[PDB]
Enzyme design. Structure first.
Site, PDB file in Angstrom:
ATOM      1  N   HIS A  18      -4.069   3.482  11.407  1.00 16.38           N
ATOM      2  CA  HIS A  18      -3.660   2.052  10.751  1.00 16.38           C
ATOM      3  C   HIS A  18      -4.380   0.858  11.250  1.00 16.38           C
ATOM      4  O   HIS A  18      -4.163  -0.271  11.100  1.00 16.38           O
ATOM      5  CB  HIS A  18      -2.041   1.698  11.459  1.00 16.38           C
ATOM      6  CG  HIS A  18      -1.059   2.845  11.367  1.00 16.38           C
ATOM      7  ND1 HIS A  18      -0.627   3.301   9.986  1.00 16.38           N
ATOM      8  CD2 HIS A  18      -0.575   3.837  11.990  1.00 16.38           C
ATOM      9  CE1 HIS A  18      -0.219   4.403  10.187  1.00 16.38           C
ATOM     10  NE2 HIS A  18       0.074   4.723  11.138  1.00 16.38           N
TER      11      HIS A  18
ATOM     12  N   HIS B 209     -11.907   1.849 -13.222  1.00 18.22           N
ATOM     13  CA  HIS B 209     -12.042   3.454 -14.031  1.00 18.22           C
ATOM     14  C   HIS B 209     -10.913   4.070 -13.195  1.00 18.22           C
ATOM     15  O   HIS B 209     -10.692   5.284 -13.643  1.00 18.22           O
ATOM     16  CB  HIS B 209     -13.531   4.013 -13.669  1.00 18.22           C
ATOM     17  CG  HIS B 209     -13.564   4.122 -12.338  1.00 18.22           C
ATOM     18  ND1 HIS B 209     -14.520   3.334 -11.603  1.00 18.22           N
ATOM     19  CD2 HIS B 209     -13.525   5.433 -11.693  1.00 18.22           C
ATOM     20  CE1 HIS B 209     -14.662   4.126 -10.258  1.00 18.22           C
ATOM     21  NE2 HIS B 209     -14.239   5.195 -10.331  1.00 18.22           N
TER      22      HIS B 209
ATOM     23  N   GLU C  72       5.011   9.175   9.773  1.00 19.58           N
ATOM     24  CA  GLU C  72       4.472   7.693  10.014  1.00 19.58           C
ATOM     25  C   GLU C  72       5.377   6.675   9.833  1.00 19.58           C
ATOM     26  O   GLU C  72       5.505   6.108   8.733  1.00 19.58           O
ATOM     27  CB  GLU C  72       3.211   7.888   9.161  1.00 19.58           C
ATOM     28  CG  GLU C  72       2.341   8.760   9.217  1.00 19.58           C
ATOM     29  CD  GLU C  72       0.869   8.743   8.648  1.00 19.58           C
ATOM     30  OE1 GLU C  72       0.703   7.811   8.136  1.00 19.58           O
ATOM     31  OE2 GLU C  72       0.079   9.697   8.888  1.00 19.58           O
TER      32      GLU C  72
ATOM     33  N   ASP D 201     -16.143  -3.542 -12.701  1.00 21.04           N
ATOM     34  CA  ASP D 201     -15.277  -2.472 -12.262  1.00 21.04           C
ATOM     35  C   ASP D 201     -14.237  -2.753 -11.255  1.00 21.04           C
ATOM     36  O   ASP D 201     -14.305  -2.418 -10.147  1.00 21.04           O
ATOM     37  CB  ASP D 201     -16.202  -1.176 -11.630  1.00 21.04           C
ATOM     38  CG  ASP D 201     -15.598   0.147 -11.690  1.00 21.04           C
ATOM     39  OD1 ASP D 201     -14.318   0.273 -12.387  1.00 21.04           O
ATOM     40  OD2 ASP D 201     -16.026   0.975 -11.159  1.00 21.04           O
TER      41      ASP D 201
ATOM     42  N   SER E 176     -13.450   5.913  -4.916  1.00 20.95           N
ATOM     43  CA  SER E 176     -13.364   4.799  -5.948  1.00 20.95           C
ATOM     44  C   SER E 176     -12.026   3.842  -5.677  1.00 20.95           C
ATOM     45  O   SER E 176     -10.943   4.589  -5.531  1.00 20.95           O
ATOM     46  CB  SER E 176     -13.489   5.185  -7.171  1.00 20.95           C
ATOM     47  OG  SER E 176     -14.630   5.420  -7.573  1.00 20.95           O
TER      48      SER E 176
END
Lengths: 11, 220
Positions: B10, B41, B58, B83, B174
């Site tokens: 965390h 993308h 969690e 992007d 990404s």
């Protein structure tokens, strides 16, 4: 080449 | 993340997991209670977004739906550039101890800036981790980025990493955050294949160039 991390550029 | 380690639990509370049928394909970054940045993308018609996670397998974690997103209008014009996209969560998330938004850097990247990148993308051993990974990378100059990523370097991009230590982002990272000097500076975008080559930085979306577009969209 390059790749999104997908499109790759061969170079 | 190549040659990183498990993040401290965390410690990156803005990290968002983008999953489809409970399989991760990208990350994103919580920038406001109702808004997640990611790479354009990573665009999909809808999203399930994991917040407050450490493992993908969690108290305080949430899975939320997002039915709306907008890619930057010049994404991929030219190729690989601009992007970024904004995902609007279907409900705002009340900030908690483990789900918190991060501010975008007011400065643009400059060589030598010290950063951290995190994600659930490929490890150095070719496997997909269950636990969020973190690694340190440093910004290199625009001239380094331009030379290495000729012919496609564009000012919507910047480079970080490339050390002999072979620390890098990789596939599945990404859209995730690059935090430089404690502010959100970039999103994981692309790099050379394979990831983690000696000398070869990764490429990140240059968020300081997009703060006006981001906030105009948020406020619209």
């Amino acid at each position: 080449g390059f790749c999104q991390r997908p499109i790759c550029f061969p170079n | 993340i190549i040659n990183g380690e498990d993040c401290s639990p965390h410690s990156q509370p803005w990290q968002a997991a983008l999953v489809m049928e409970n399989e991760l394909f990208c990350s994103g970054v919580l920038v406001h209670p109702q808004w997640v940045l990611s790479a354009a993308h990573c665009f999909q018609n809808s999203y399930t977004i994991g917040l407050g996670l450490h493992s993908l397998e969690e108290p305080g974690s949430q899975m939320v739906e997002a039915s709306l997103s907008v890619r930057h209008p010049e994404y991929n014009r030219p190729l690989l550039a601009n992007d970024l996209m904004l995902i609007k969560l279907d409900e705002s998330v009340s900030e908690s101890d483990t789900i918190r938004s991060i501010s975008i850097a007011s400065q643009c990247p400059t060589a030598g800036n010290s950063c951290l990148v995190s994600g659930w993308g490929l490890l150095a051993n070719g496997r997909m981790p269950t636990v969020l990974q973190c690694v340190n990378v440093s910004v290199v100059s625009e001239e380094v980025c331009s030379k290495l990523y000729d012919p496609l370097y564009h000012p919507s991009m910047f480079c970080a990493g490339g050390g002999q230590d072979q620390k890098d982002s990789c596939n599945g990272d990404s859209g995730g955050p690059l935090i430089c000097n404690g502010y959100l500076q970039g999103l994981v975008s692309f790099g050379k294949a394979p990831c983690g080559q000696v000398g070869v930085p990764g490429v990140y979306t240059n968020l300081c160039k997009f703060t006006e577009w981001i906030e105009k969209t948020v406020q619209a």
